[PDB]
Amino acid sequence: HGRIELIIGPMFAGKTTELMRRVQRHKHAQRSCYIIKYTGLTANVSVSNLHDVGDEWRKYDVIAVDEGQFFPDVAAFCSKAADSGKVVIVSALDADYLQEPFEEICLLVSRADSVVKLSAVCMECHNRKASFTYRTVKSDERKLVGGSDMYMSVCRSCYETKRN
Amino acid sequence: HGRIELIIGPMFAGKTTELMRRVQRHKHAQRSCYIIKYTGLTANVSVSNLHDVGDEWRKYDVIAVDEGQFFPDVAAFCSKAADSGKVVIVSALDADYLQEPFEEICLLVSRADSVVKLSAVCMECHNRKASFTYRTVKSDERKLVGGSDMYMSVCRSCYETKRN
Amino acid sequence: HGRIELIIGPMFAGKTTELMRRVQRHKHAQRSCYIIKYTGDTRHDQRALTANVSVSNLHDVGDEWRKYDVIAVDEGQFFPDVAAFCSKAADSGKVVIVSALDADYLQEPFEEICLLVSRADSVVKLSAVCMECHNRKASFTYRTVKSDERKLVGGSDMYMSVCRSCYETKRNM
Amino acid sequence: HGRIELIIGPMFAGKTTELMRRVQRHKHAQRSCYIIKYTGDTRHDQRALTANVSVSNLHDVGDEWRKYDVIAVDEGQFFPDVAAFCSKAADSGKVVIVSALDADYLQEPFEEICLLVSRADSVVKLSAVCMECHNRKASFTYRTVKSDERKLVGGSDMYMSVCRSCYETKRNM
Ligand SMILES: Cc1cn([C@H]2C[C@H](O)[C@@H](CO)O2)c(=O)[nH]c1=O
Ligand SMILES: Cc1cn([C@H]2C[C@H](O)[C@@H](CO)O2)c(=O)[nH]c1=O
Ligand SMILES: Cc1cn([C@H]2C[C@H](O)[C@@H](CO)O2)c(=O)[nH]c1=O
Ligand SMILES: Cc1cn([C@H]2C[C@H](O)[C@@H](CO)O2)c(=O)[nH]c1=O
Ligand SMILES: [Zn+2]
Ligand SMILES: [Zn+2]
Ligand SMILES: [Zn+2]
Ligand SMILES: [Zn+2]
């Protein structure tokens, strides 16, 4: 019946591209896919609690959740949908800019049938796989929406070096 | 220094999306990428022999070749470029519609640092991973350019069943 | 230089075998490899093919780990300080390879292995085959004896790996 | 129902260990597993943990394979009829798992394993660690003794796995 697939890794690793790659595969076989985006055959939605999707997700074979770390109830949602027979596919950061985990994505790891962690390329040294996201601006808000001028994906030693 | 990464699998598996996912990762780290398409920071090209790229590829860190099975000299090209220090990334069909291999992509398998085979979803039964491409029109031309109205990706047993 | 590779999944998924596969690769290239096992864990021991030690926490290895290129930690969920140990060692240039359960018998995470996920360069989650229905990939471990101790050391005499629906079916009974 | 899983890569990459990891998973779910080895291949034998046989070609197994859920073929490149055997068995509903070299010591493909790639549901290529430089992933096998026999049975006494540039450097010498 149902399942949970989780795609994790730092920023700039292509997690969302991989999520969509997987959604597209299902669409070619005539499966209905519902894509849930965050904001503070097919159907799309931008939302801020998974509670706000209501029961719309039940009309679909495949449910995809992007930026899963922004949703506070994501693990319970995914479990409920997978228990109802859906293929659920989630892309999320596993770690925040302090290399500390998103507790809800932890729960997903433990509930997932598959977990892939993608890597990026180090934006500091340009020579190594990157597994970490470095926040290049001062802020102690955990959630801070932004791109390459506020964050960069780095290798282990560039992360240490830049922590000075 | 250099390497060869190969992405194989049947049609509708998202091989090209995965190739581009990888190219994008490199671009975020300021690496130059040259993309070579078939037709009968960045640069694109449509060509029919890899001979026709000349030595343009030497100006790039990363070389990507799409639809590799259409190029008759692809293995030697990839080896030459990887021996010169390039990251080479190739997407190709491993098997033709008769489940017979493309001999040049065989050579690549043996020369590659990494080989991933993606799956599609079965377009006949809609219930299983698909690893094969079934040609739905009569033709005994090996090369026959087309989409879902001429081909479908199928699972092992749907391929047998449809072979009647 | 250094890195953390994590292998997770339920019981019966071959996590230790994958660990030892990776160690052997390094050994062919003449790299020094140290395997750290948990002293309480009782289960051919492939882990006797290089330098190794049995401890109850990682503090008791002392600084012996510094003498190696590669450090492998088996049954990582048993060690209370595993994340920090791994990070210290990977910061000193070691290739650190850890096998661990990500989830306990209640599908609740081991918090220390959660930290490792976030610190790891590589994370693979292996599957088992459902030992109840025999027809599906299994991602969960089901405890088949009555005990509410979170830690309870054992094998197929006390646990089985199951698919998502077999885990539900068996919990309701 | 049936499938073909292929594990390729150079020597010292742990292909047989991965094969036996997969067999063990199936065994925990009580599935019948048969391991077919090559009679000429001399190299703890994990492959003695289920039903097994040593043959020179696959024809000599006869129909014994039909009694199993899972068939594993080790050193597939030695068998002249391996592709057809695998396809026959996978068409009868078996999970067939093959480990093999994809490339010989000259980086030239084993044609029969090429056919398997095209017939396989899953293909993984494992790497080794470069046994010359000790600093890079290795995807090639280098023969360290003089012999132009394509088939020459041996281990680290006759071969080493190497990265792309170490293979060039050593060929020029
Ligand atoms: C690493 C990190 C990223 N982000 C954001 C930046 C982007 O908008 C988004 C990454 O997709 O999440 C945070 O909010 N906090 C963090 O700690
Ligand atoms: C399976 C198969 C696909 N193709 C084509 C169809 C598409 O144009 C392309 C797949 O990208 O290759 C062939 O030319 N021959 C074949 O046997
Ligand atoms: C799933 C699970 C296993 N175990 C034990 C059984 C084994 O000895 C070890 C896993 O190999 O962990 C626990 O102690 N708690 C649990 O929740
Ligand atoms: C690379 C290579 C290995 N071998 C042998 C050595 C081993 O006995 C077996 C690989 O495990 O294959 C060959 O016979 N020819 C070759 O080209
Ligand atoms: Zn770096
Ligand atoms: Zn089908
Ligand atoms: Zn089950
Ligand atoms: Zn080397």
Short mmCIF file of N, CA and C in Angstrom, two decimals, chain D residues 49-129:
data_model
loop_
_atom_site.label_atom_id
_atom_site.label_comp_id
_atom_site.label_asym_id
_atom_site.label_seq_id
_atom_site.Cartn_x
_atom_site.Cartn_y
_atom_site.Cartn_z
N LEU D 49 26.37 -20.50 4.26
CA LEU D 49 25.18 -20.26 5.10
C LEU D 49 23.80 -20.55 4.41
N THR D 50 23.78 -20.92 3.12
CA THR D 50 22.57 -21.49 2.54
C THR D 50 22.88 -22.58 1.53
N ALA D 51 21.86 -23.16 0.91
CA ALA D 51 22.11 -24.10 -0.22
C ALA D 51 23.01 -23.51 -1.27
N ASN D 52 23.96 -24.26 -1.72
CA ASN D 52 24.93 -23.75 -2.70
C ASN D 52 25.55 -24.82 -3.53
N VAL D 53 26.19 -24.41 -4.61
CA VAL D 53 26.75 -25.32 -5.59
C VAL D 53 27.87 -24.58 -6.35
N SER D 54 28.86 -25.34 -6.78
CA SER D 54 30.00 -24.91 -7.60
C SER D 54 29.90 -25.53 -8.97
N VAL D 55 29.79 -24.72 -9.99
CA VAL D 55 29.67 -25.28 -11.32
C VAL D 55 30.57 -24.45 -12.28
N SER D 56 30.76 -24.95 -13.52
CA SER D 56 31.57 -24.26 -14.60
C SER D 56 30.70 -23.68 -15.59
N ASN D 57 29.49 -24.19 -15.70
CA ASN D 57 28.51 -23.31 -16.34
C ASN D 57 27.17 -23.57 -15.75
N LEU D 58 26.27 -22.71 -16.11
CA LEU D 58 24.98 -22.71 -15.50
C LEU D 58 24.07 -23.79 -15.94
N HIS D 59 24.40 -24.36 -17.08
CA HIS D 59 23.67 -25.49 -17.60
C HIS D 59 23.76 -26.61 -16.58
N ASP D 60 24.92 -26.80 -15.96
CA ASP D 60 25.08 -27.91 -14.97
C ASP D 60 24.31 -27.88 -13.63
N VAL D 61 23.60 -26.81 -13.38
CA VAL D 61 22.74 -26.68 -12.23
C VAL D 61 21.50 -27.46 -12.54
N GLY D 62 21.24 -27.66 -13.84
CA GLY D 62 20.01 -28.31 -14.25
C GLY D 62 18.83 -27.45 -13.88
N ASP D 63 17.80 -28.09 -13.32
CA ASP D 63 16.58 -27.44 -12.88
C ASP D 63 16.50 -27.25 -11.35
N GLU D 64 17.63 -27.46 -10.66
CA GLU D 64 17.68 -27.35 -9.18
C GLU D 64 17.27 -25.95 -8.68
N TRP D 65 17.61 -24.95 -9.48
CA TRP D 65 17.29 -23.56 -9.20
C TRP D 65 15.82 -23.29 -9.07
N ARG D 66 14.99 -24.15 -9.64
CA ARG D 66 13.56 -23.88 -9.55
C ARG D 66 12.99 -24.06 -8.19
N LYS D 67 13.72 -24.72 -7.30
CA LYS D 67 13.30 -24.93 -5.95
C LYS D 67 13.53 -23.78 -5.00
N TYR D 68 13.88 -22.61 -5.51
CA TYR D 68 14.26 -21.51 -4.66
C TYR D 68 13.52 -20.23 -5.05
N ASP D 69 13.30 -19.37 -4.06
CA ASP D 69 12.81 -18.03 -4.23
C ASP D 69 13.91 -17.09 -4.78
N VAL D 70 15.15 -17.30 -4.39
CA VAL D 70 16.25 -16.37 -4.64
C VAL D 70 17.42 -17.15 -5.08
N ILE D 71 18.03 -16.67 -6.16
CA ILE D 71 19.19 -17.29 -6.77
C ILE D 71 20.26 -16.22 -6.81
N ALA D 72 21.44 -16.55 -6.31
CA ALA D 72 22.57 -15.66 -6.32
C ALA D 72 23.70 -16.26 -7.08
N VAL D 73 24.31 -15.50 -7.96
CA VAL D 73 25.36 -15.98 -8.80
C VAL D 73 26.56 -15.10 -8.53
N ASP D 74 27.63 -15.71 -8.06
CA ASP D 74 28.83 -15.02 -7.73
C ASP D 74 29.89 -15.18 -8.85
N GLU D 75 30.65 -14.13 -9.14
CA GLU D 75 31.70 -14.12 -10.17
C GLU D 75 31.05 -14.38 -11.57
N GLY D 76 30.01 -13.62 -11.88
CA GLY D 76 29.18 -13.87 -13.02
C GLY D 76 29.93 -13.81 -14.33
N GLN D 77 31.01 -13.04 -14.36
CA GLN D 77 31.78 -12.92 -15.55
C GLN D 77 32.45 -14.22 -16.03
N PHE D 78 32.57 -15.20 -15.15
CA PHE D 78 33.11 -16.49 -15.52
C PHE D 78 32.15 -17.39 -16.28
N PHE D 79 30.86 -17.11 -16.26
CA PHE D 79 29.89 -18.01 -16.78
C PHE D 79 29.52 -17.56 -18.17
N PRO D 80 29.68 -18.47 -19.15
CA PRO D 80 29.41 -18.09 -20.56
C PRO D 80 27.93 -17.87 -20.90
N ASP D 81 27.01 -18.42 -20.12
CA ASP D 81 25.62 -18.32 -20.47
C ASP D 81 24.81 -17.56 -19.40
N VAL D 82 25.46 -16.70 -18.65
CA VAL D 82 24.82 -16.09 -17.52
C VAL D 82 23.63 -15.22 -17.81
N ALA D 83 23.69 -14.45 -18.86
CA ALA D 83 22.51 -13.60 -19.16
C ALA D 83 21.22 -14.32 -19.42
N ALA D 84 21.32 -15.40 -20.19
CA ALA D 84 20.16 -16.13 -20.54
C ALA D 84 19.61 -16.84 -19.29
N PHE D 85 20.52 -17.37 -18.46
CA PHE D 85 20.13 -18.08 -17.22
C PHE D 85 19.35 -17.16 -16.33
N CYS D 86 19.90 -15.99 -16.13
CA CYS D 86 19.23 -14.99 -15.31
C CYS D 86 17.86 -14.63 -15.82
N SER D 87 17.75 -14.43 -17.13
CA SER D 87 16.47 -14.02 -17.71
C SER D 87 15.42 -15.16 -17.57
N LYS D 88 15.84 -16.40 -17.82
CA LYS D 88 14.96 -17.54 -17.66
C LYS D 88 14.44 -17.63 -16.23
N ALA D 89 15.35 -17.42 -15.29
CA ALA D 89 14.98 -17.57 -13.90
C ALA D 89 14.13 -16.43 -13.50
N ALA D 90 14.52 -15.22 -13.84
CA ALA D 90 13.63 -14.05 -13.50
C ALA D 90 12.27 -14.19 -14.18
N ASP D 91 12.22 -14.73 -15.40
CA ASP D 91 10.87 -14.96 -16.04
C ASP D 91 10.04 -15.99 -15.32
N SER D 92 10.66 -16.98 -14.64
CA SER D 92 9.93 -17.90 -13.75
C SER D 92 9.57 -17.38 -12.36
N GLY D 93 9.84 -16.12 -12.05
CA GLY D 93 9.49 -15.54 -10.78
C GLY D 93 10.59 -15.43 -9.71
N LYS D 94 11.82 -15.73 -10.05
CA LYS D 94 12.89 -15.68 -9.08
C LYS D 94 13.48 -14.31 -8.95
N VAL D 95 13.95 -14.02 -7.75
CA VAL D 95 14.79 -12.87 -7.50
C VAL D 95 16.20 -13.40 -7.78
N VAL D 96 16.86 -12.86 -8.78
CA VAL D 96 18.18 -13.26 -9.18
C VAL D 96 19.17 -12.15 -8.90
N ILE D 97 20.27 -12.46 -8.23
CA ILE D 97 21.18 -11.42 -7.75
C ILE D 97 22.53 -11.84 -8.27
N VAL D 98 23.25 -10.96 -8.98
CA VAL D 98 24.48 -11.36 -9.60
C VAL D 98 25.54 -10.39 -9.22
N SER D 99 26.71 -10.92 -8.85
CA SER D 99 27.91 -10.09 -8.71
C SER D 99 28.86 -10.46 -9.80
N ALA D 100 29.51 -9.46 -10.38
CA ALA D 100 30.39 -9.65 -11.48
C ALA D 100 31.25 -8.48 -11.70
N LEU D 101 32.45 -8.75 -12.28
CA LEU D 101 33.23 -7.66 -12.90
C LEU D 101 32.50 -7.19 -14.17
N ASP D 102 32.40 -5.89 -14.34
CA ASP D 102 31.91 -5.29 -15.57
C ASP D 102 33.06 -5.15 -16.59
N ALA D 103 34.26 -4.90 -16.10
CA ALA D 103 35.50 -4.69 -16.88
C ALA D 103 36.62 -5.66 -16.52
N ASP D 104 37.41 -6.04 -17.52
CA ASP D 104 38.59 -6.89 -17.29
C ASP D 104 39.74 -5.96 -16.96
N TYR D 105 40.92 -6.53 -16.83
CA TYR D 105 42.14 -5.79 -16.51
C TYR D 105 42.60 -4.79 -17.54
N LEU D 106 42.02 -4.87 -18.73
CA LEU D 106 42.29 -3.87 -19.80
C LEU D 106 41.20 -2.83 -19.93
N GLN D 107 40.28 -2.79 -18.98
CA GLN D 107 39.13 -1.90 -18.98
C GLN D 107 38.16 -2.21 -20.10
N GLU D 108 38.21 -3.43 -20.60
CA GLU D 108 37.30 -3.87 -21.64
C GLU D 108 36.17 -4.70 -21.05
N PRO D 109 34.95 -4.46 -21.50
CA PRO D 109 33.84 -5.12 -20.90
C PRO D 109 33.69 -6.60 -21.12
N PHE D 110 33.13 -7.27 -20.12
CA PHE D 110 32.64 -8.61 -20.26
C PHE D 110 31.25 -8.49 -20.87
N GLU D 111 31.16 -9.03 -22.07
CA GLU D 111 30.02 -8.84 -22.95
C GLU D 111 28.73 -9.41 -22.33
N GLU D 112 28.88 -10.54 -21.68
CA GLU D 112 27.75 -11.20 -21.05
C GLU D 112 27.18 -10.29 -19.87
N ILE D 113 28.05 -9.51 -19.23
CA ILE D 113 27.64 -8.69 -18.10
C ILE D 113 26.99 -7.41 -18.67
N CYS D 114 27.51 -6.96 -19.77
CA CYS D 114 26.78 -5.98 -20.63
C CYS D 114 25.39 -6.35 -20.96
N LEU D 115 25.18 -7.57 -21.45
CA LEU D 115 23.79 -8.00 -21.62
C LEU D 115 23.01 -7.91 -20.33
N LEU D 116 23.64 -8.28 -19.19
CA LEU D 116 22.87 -8.25 -17.90
C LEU D 116 22.46 -6.85 -17.49
N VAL D 117 23.34 -5.88 -17.73
CA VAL D 117 23.01 -4.52 -17.42
C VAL D 117 21.67 -4.18 -18.06
N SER D 118 21.51 -4.58 -19.31
CA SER D 118 20.31 -4.17 -20.12
C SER D 118 19.13 -4.92 -19.67
N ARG D 119 19.35 -6.09 -19.07
CA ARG D 119 18.21 -6.92 -18.56
C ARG D 119 17.84 -6.75 -17.10
N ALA D 120 18.63 -5.96 -16.40
CA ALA D 120 18.52 -5.85 -14.97
C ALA D 120 17.54 -4.81 -14.51
N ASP D 121 16.84 -5.12 -13.42
CA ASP D 121 15.98 -4.16 -12.76
C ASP D 121 16.81 -3.18 -11.97
N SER D 122 17.98 -3.59 -11.52
CA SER D 122 18.77 -2.74 -10.63
C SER D 122 20.21 -2.98 -10.96
N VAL D 123 21.01 -1.94 -10.98
CA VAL D 123 22.44 -2.09 -11.27
C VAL D 123 23.12 -1.12 -10.33
N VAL D 124 24.03 -1.64 -9.53
CA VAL D 124 24.88 -0.82 -8.67
C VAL D 124 26.29 -1.09 -9.06
N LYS D 125 27.07 -0.07 -9.15
CA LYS D 125 28.49 -0.25 -9.39
C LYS D 125 29.23 0.16 -8.14
N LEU D 126 29.89 -0.76 -7.45
CA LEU D 126 30.63 -0.37 -6.22
C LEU D 126 32.04 0.03 -6.61
N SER D 127 32.65 0.77 -5.75
CA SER D 127 34.02 1.19 -5.89
C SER D 127 34.87 0.49 -4.85
N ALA D 128 36.16 0.55 -5.06
CA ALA D 128 37.16 0.11 -4.18
C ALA D 128 37.93 1.34 -3.76
N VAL D 129 38.97 1.17 -2.94
CA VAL D 129 39.89 2.30 -2.65
C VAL D 129 41.16 2.06 -3.41
#
